[PDB]
């Protein structure tokens, strides 16, 4: 007993550069998801089509607790997780990953950014043995240049992605930001 899945397979590594010299330190603090791709099935619920933030701070340790908000049924929701360096700067394995049921891999890798306006960073992992990959397109703010958006359609494509498996969420002031 149990199921069946049908997903794009992940690429292979070749595919997906590693900044150069990643500089953790550059990188901490809050970041915009301005685009989401990956091989998920997408979701029709249309409130997760709403803009997400995230908060990397870098511990004494070199981790960083990520944190993640979004705004969803009417609630604030919170989820943070512990990246540690991985094999290269610019990768990151997952922090205590027993306590995530089902989940077993897990692998972070910055593709590139200029630390204070964007970035791509892509994810791998398997979870209930499917593997999964995501890209999400980082902003300092809410909105970014349409040339930004145009190059993560196109390494998203490369990847073997189609389209419909390509969003931009929607700017929001619930969570994300916080209050006036
Ligand atoms: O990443 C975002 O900013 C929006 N995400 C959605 C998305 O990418 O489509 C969720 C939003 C989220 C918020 C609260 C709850 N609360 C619950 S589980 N309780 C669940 C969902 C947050 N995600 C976790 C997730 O996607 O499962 C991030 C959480 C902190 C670690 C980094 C992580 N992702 C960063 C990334 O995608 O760039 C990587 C990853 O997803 O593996
Ligand atoms: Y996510």
Redesign the pocket.
Known sequence: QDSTSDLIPAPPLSKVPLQQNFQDNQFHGKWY?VG?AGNAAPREDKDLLKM???TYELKEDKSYN?????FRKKMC?????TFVPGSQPGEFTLGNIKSYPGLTSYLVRVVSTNYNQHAM?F?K?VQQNREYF?I?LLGRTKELASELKENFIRFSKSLGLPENHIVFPVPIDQCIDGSA
């Open positions: 998801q989401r997400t933030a995230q990520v944190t993640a908000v979004r929701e919170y989820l943070t997780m960073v994810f992992k995501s999400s």
